[PDB]
């Protein structure tokens, strides 16, 4: 195709059913009804017109740029929007239901691949999944249509609330004797001028009580009977709801007003809550009805594993398409291992070494494991390695589940297309990689053969396993201090064989301390039928644990389906929709570790995603952003299908987002590769020209922000849009806020669209920063951080929320003057804050600068973030300091680093312009903030380590193995006492600043 845009008029070749073909000149913008009608008016000039019916009996088909033979049922669509590979149309008679096909097209646009590609999949697991997961779709659709229209509004506009109503006393103390004042607004005229009604109310009033005080204040002089007032209250309670001014957030549920996140922030920031009084019928009006039509594809002797008396045995036959220099290396061989998660169940075994030019072994490999001892989650990890001291390295890897999704043991010959080795991985095998076969062509194909035991073999039912447990089991103070001691240690603590079998010995006394379950499970001999059978019984009746603990059991160290099932049941019962929406990035990544498409976790996530459109929004984008990765493209694809097929009318909005982003990447691709030989000034005059296009304007205007769909993006401010002066040249974008009362929130919605570098390192750090900020607030430390919005929407492409009224400290240094010889004046920053915080607010700006500065020192040190400099350190006009561009973390490349060094510029702000900054009382108070913040993270180090370990399979090179996470165990000094940790933190800070600590 290779055409950016069709000319205004083009020649399309139309293939008529009588055999003729007609070259029809037609407008680019022309719709198919226009094309089909004028075609059959042109067809009359060609032979064999008698054989043609009325155009009503035909539709067009063609081949898209995705190689899809698409039937253009939706004839309202525009020629230039069809994604045509070639400008031709084949007239045909329509067949099949029209709604399924027009819906599948818009689903394919959303998920990024034609849905028909799923129909042509051999794998039975793929066809069973998309069939069987439809039940989760219907039970979620039924659950939102029940109790309409309120239930539907709760799905599309769910309450944005904190996890608990109780205000931390730090926040309650800002209230005026436990009360907050709010201004409630009303649009009163057609011209849309507004009225104000200011109230003072208890912080824990529910929205309906706020409605009651508003109508009471308005009717104070009406002389209402006590009952006549209540009728007015009932009326306005049942007729109106409250909306946040400037954004699409509504208070539709009777939570205490102080736990709605918008208002708890107004209490935190001391701002003035602005709420619009809205007629709830006017809200239900903008919620069109949507339905879940069951798709078309929803239609249409064994023995036990525990009776095979033999050791495991697998045959390695040959390989193909192996790419290696026959003259540079010596030989190749196949390395194999039997794994249960990350732990090999038995010692590995290799084939014999063979010349590169003849990859052929035909070897039976014997493994030191008795088949009945195989755990259910057992899997074969293998690779093809080269050899040339003696040094090895892998050429291509591949993993296989010894049991399929039907509980059967693999048997017979099997071909396995291998995957490339991930960048920077020297390990010979890749057990944490996905089980599957590379769909790419000409990839090295390794052929194997599994034993056939005269019949299909199945894993024993749980009924038989508990029998064997009872059969195998038949064959105090200082101890309970050990159990409580080992429970305390972090997830990645060293547990010795002495501690393991001690835990396994007291496995029954462990139930009294349920959070010990991760340690105990790691002590089980998973390569023994006996121990596993007993552990299943403990898990069956294990006391539930809190979600932040169960999330550990979903990482790559716990593959057993009974452990994960227990973990998932902990989440669906204890994980609030708030903390689900906060950890969603990890819960989506641990889907990769799942052995099978159909599991309890994915069904859990999909359900909550289809019953809470807030988490369903990022549930879609985190999956869509990774659809380029072929290793997971199929799983995430089928999952996206199920979602987009039942999410409701929100699909129409998602497509406007996907289409808008698609034109930002197409445009930015042209500027970075087609028009690369030009500077900024000449690229700007080209940028605006493309943005002047109507089609571009119609697409990029009037849609929802992917960073937060509550923000509507109205018309563009072209004059404010630009291409930024950075190496990768991103786009600075500015929309108007079309809210009726945008003037009360923000009229400028500014986002940076960046295409070039990977953004999911920043999503994680920004997520991490938000976590540690939240626990600091809840522990009395008011260290305001700024986890701005960042979202990866594709392969090295995403969006970044820009902070209003902020500058880099470099930009600020340039506002001042020079002092030393060719040296900026250290006092420029302080003079800048003074200039913008004159008077009594000065003591506040320095307090906000000191507190935020303390939080970013601790956060950056713990995480080993890339070195800070004056162009990635920023400070608000407000005085708040924050960082940007969290490129690397955990010390990525080649000592205990300190990336954020307090130059003199910051100290002369903290010390309010003194000379002996390190000796002032103001600086000693800043140090007290850091120490408390650091120790506060140490006492929450478990959930931070679990968050990183759940991201190991993400593919981020900064962390590939559990060893990479050890950096955090070092900066937090988890193998030492709190006192040794405090002393350690001071040590590193002192060395970095050459004294003071």
């Amino acid at each position: 195709w290779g055409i950016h845009l069709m000319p205004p008029r083009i020649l399309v070749e139309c293939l008529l059913p009588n055999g003729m073909i007609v070259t029809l000149e037609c407008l680019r913008e022309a719709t198919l009804i226009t094309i089909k009608h004028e075609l059959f008016k042109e067809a009359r000039k060609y032979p064999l017109h008698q054989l043609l019916q009325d155009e009503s009996s035909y539709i067009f088909v063609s081949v898209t740029q995705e190689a899809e033979r698409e039937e253009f049922f939706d004839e309202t669509r525009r020629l230039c929007d069809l994604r045509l590979f070639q400008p031709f149309l084949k007239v045909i008679e329509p067949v099949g239901n029209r709604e399924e096909k027009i819906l599948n097209r818009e689903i394919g646009f959303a998920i990024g691949m034609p849905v028909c590609e799923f129909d042509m999949v051999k794998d039975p697991e793929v066809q069973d999944f998309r069939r069987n997961i439809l039940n989760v779709c219907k039970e979620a659709v039924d659950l939102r249509d029940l109790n309409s229209p309120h239930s539907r509004a709760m799905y599309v506009y769910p309450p944005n609330v904190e996890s608990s109503p109780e205000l931390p006393k730090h926040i309650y103390n800002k209230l005026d004797k436990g009360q907050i004042i709010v201004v409630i607004w009303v649009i009163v005229s057609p011209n849309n001028d507004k009225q104000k009604y200011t109230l003072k109310i208890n912080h824990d009033c529910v929205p309906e009580q706020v409605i009651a005080e508003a109508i009471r204040k308005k009717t104070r002089s009406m002389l209402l009977s006590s009952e006549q007032l209540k009728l007015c209250v009932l009326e306005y309670q049942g007729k109106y709801i409250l909306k946040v001014c400037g954004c699409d957030e509504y208070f539709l549920e009777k939570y205490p007003l102080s736990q709605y996140k918008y208002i708890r922030s107004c209490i935190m920031l001391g701002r003035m809550p602005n709420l619009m009084l809205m007629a709830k019928e006017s809200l239900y009006s903008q919620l069109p009805m949507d339905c879940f039509t069951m798709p078309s594809y929803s239609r249409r002797s064994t023995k036990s594993l525990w009776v095979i008396n033999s050791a495991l045995r697998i045959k390695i036959l040959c390989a193909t398409y192996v790419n290696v220099n026959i003259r540079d290396i010596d030989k190749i061989y196949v390395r194999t291992g039997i794994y249960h998660g990350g732990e090999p169940l038995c010692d590995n075994v290799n084939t014999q070494r063979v010349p590169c030019s003849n990859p052929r072994w035909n070897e039976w490999l014997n493994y030191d494991i008795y088949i009945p001892d195989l755990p259910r989650a057992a899997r074969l990890c293998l690779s093809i390695c080269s050899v040339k001291k003696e040094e090895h390295c892998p050429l291509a890897w591949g993993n296989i589940n010894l049991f399929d999704y039907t509980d059967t043991l693999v048997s017979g010959k099997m071909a396995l297309n291998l995957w490339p080795v991930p960048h920077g991985l020297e390990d010979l095998l890749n057990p944490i990689g996905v089980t599957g076969s590379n769909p790419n062509k000409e990839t090295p194909c390794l052929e194997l053969e599994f034993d056939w035991f005269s019949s299909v073999v199945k894993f024993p039912d749980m009924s038989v396993i508990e029998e064997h447990a009872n059969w195998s089991v038949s064959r105090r103070e200082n101890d309970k201090e050990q159990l409580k001691a080992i429970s305390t240690r972090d997830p990645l603590s060293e547990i010795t064989e002495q501690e393991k079998d001690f835990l396994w010995s007291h496995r029954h006394y462990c139930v009294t301390i349920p959070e010990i379950l991760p340690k105990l499970l790691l002590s089980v001999k998973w390569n023994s039928r006996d121990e596993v059978a007993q552990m299943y019984c403990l898990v069956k009746d294990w006391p539930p644990i809190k979600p932040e603990q169960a999330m550990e059991l979903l990482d790559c160290n716990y593959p057993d389906p009974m452990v994960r099932g227990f973990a998932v049941r902990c989440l669906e019962k204890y994980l609030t929709d708030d903390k689900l929406s906060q950890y969603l990035i990890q819960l989506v990544q641990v889907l990769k570790y799942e052995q099978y498409l159909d599991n309890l976790l994915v069904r859990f996530l999909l359900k909550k995603a289809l019953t809470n459109q807030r988490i369903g929004h990022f549930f879609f984008w985190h999956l869509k952003s990774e659809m380029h990765n072929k290793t997971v493209s199929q799983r995430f694809g089928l999952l996206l299908e199920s979602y987009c097929r039942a999410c409701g009318m929100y699909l129409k909005h998602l497509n406007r987002q996907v289409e808008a982003m698609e034109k930002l990447i197409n445009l930015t691709d042209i500027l970075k590769q087609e028009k690369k030989d030009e500077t900024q000034k000449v690229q700007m005059k080209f940028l605006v020209e493309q943005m002047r296009r109507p089609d571009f304007m119609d697409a990029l205007q009037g849609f929802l922000s992917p960073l937060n769909p509550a923000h509507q993006l109205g018309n563009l401010r072209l004059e404010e849009c630009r291409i930024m002066s950075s190496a990768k040249r991103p786009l600075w974008l500015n929309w108007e806020n079309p809210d009726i009362m945008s003037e009360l929130l923000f009229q400028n919605n500014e986002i940076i669209f960046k295409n070039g570098d990977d953004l999911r390192q920043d999503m994680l750090t920004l997520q991490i920063i938000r976590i540690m900020e939240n626990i600091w607030q809840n522990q009395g430390l008011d260290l305001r951080m700024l986890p701005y919005g960042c979202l990866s929407i594709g392969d090295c492409v995403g969006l970044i929320e820009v902070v209003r009224n902020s500058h880099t400290i470099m930009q600020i240094q340039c506002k001042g003057g020079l002092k030393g010889a060719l040296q900026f004046n250290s006092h420029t920053l302080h003079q800048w804050l003074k200039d913008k915080n004159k008077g009594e607010i000065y003591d506040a700006a320095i307090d906000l600068f000191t507190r935020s500065c303390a939080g970013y020192c601790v956060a950056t040190f713990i995480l080993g973030i890339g070195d800070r400099h004056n162009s990635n350190i920023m400070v608000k006009d407000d005085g708040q300091l924050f960082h940007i561009d969290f490129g690397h973390f955990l010390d990525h490349k080649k000592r205990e680093r300190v990336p954020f060094v307090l130059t003199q510029d910051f100290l002369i702000v903290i010390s309010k312009g003194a000379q002996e900054c390190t000796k002032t009382r103001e600086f000693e108070r800043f140090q007290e903030m850091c120490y408390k913040a650091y120790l506060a993270i140490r006492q929450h180090a478990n959930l931070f380590i679990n968050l990183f370990s759940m991201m190991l399979g993400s593919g981020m090179p900064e962390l590939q193995s559990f060893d990479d996470i050890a950096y955090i165990r070092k900066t937090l000094a988890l193998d030492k006492t709190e006192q040794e940790a405090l002393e350690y933190f001071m040590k590193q800070m002192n060395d970095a600043h050459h004294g003071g600590w």
Binding site: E66, N325, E391, E497, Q498
Partner: protein, 266 residues
């Protein structure tokens, strides 16, 4: 005879470093560290069994050592030597393996400024060949992207041709009988209009198979460059780890006397 001189005692190296020194090694291989706690008296034994690295706590209680409450060893050296001959089944039948292979703490065989110079060039060799591989990796993925998109374009050509070929079969079906009538009616003009269009259909279809061929040829030659880029990457990957191994040992060999020379060298 002292623990400080034993080949298998590595001091305060990291758990992450013994994992690297034991990967893919044989059963019985073992090391000994100062426990990660870094507290006086405590040590941790790590031996390989069944493809894993088992951790064993060396307890210390009143000048004697051992794995259990009967601490029957006056020194940590005699404890390791006893099990270098007897099997660990004596402690735990689940193990049943003796310490067969220690990981010696010196193996590889001029002024400090000379080795500091030799380090400066060995590192430059490593750092510049690391840029070699990083360049091939981006050309490897840049080529991978262009290939799988050319494959879908060919499949698109395959679908268009299939559509244009059934068009020729429908033209020949519904035109046969009408051409046979126009010929005995003596109507040569209408037969010429039917063949004029048919010849145009038969011409465009050939222009399409030509575009498909020209792409098929363009893809086959790029798919070969892909395999060659993979060859030379697999040739650089082993050399790159080799040059990295000499870099780190030269760095630690020099860290014993030249902490400030490395500070200025790199």
């Amino acid at each position: 005879m002292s623990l400080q001189d034993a080949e298998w005692y590595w001091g305060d190296i990291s758990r992450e470093e013994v994992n690297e020194k034991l990967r893919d090694t044989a059963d019985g291989t073992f090391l000994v560290r100062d426990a990660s706690t870094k507290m006086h008296g405590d040590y941790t034994l790590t031996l390989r069994k069944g493809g894993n690295n088992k951790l064993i706590k060396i307890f210390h209680r009143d000048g004697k050592y051992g794995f259990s409450d009967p601490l029957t060893f006056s020194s940590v050296v005699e404890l390791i030597n006893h099990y270098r001959n007897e099997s660990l089944a004596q402690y735990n039948p689940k193990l049943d393996v003796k310490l067969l292979y220690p990981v010696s703490k010196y193996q590889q065989d001029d002024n400090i400024e000379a080795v500091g110079k030799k380090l400066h060039e060995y590192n430059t060799q490593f750092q510049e060949k690391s840029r070699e591989y990083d360049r091939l990796y981006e050309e490897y993925t840049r080529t991978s992207q262009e290939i799988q998109m050319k494959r879908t374009a060919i499949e698109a050509f395959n679908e268009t041709i299939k559509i244009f070929e059934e068009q020729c079969q429908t033209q020949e079906r519904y035109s046969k009988e009408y051409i046979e009538k126009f010929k005995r009616e003596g109507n040569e003009k209408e037969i010429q209009r039917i063949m004029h269009n048919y010849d145009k259909l038969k011409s465009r279809i050939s222009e399409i198979i030509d575009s498909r061929r020209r792409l098929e040829e363009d893809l086959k030659k790029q798919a070969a460059e892909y395999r060659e880029i993979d060859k030379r990457m697999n040739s650089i990957k082993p050399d790159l780890i080799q040059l990295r191994k000499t870099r780190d040992q030269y760095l630690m060999w020099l860290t014993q006397k030249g902490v400030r020379q490395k500070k200025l060298n790199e």
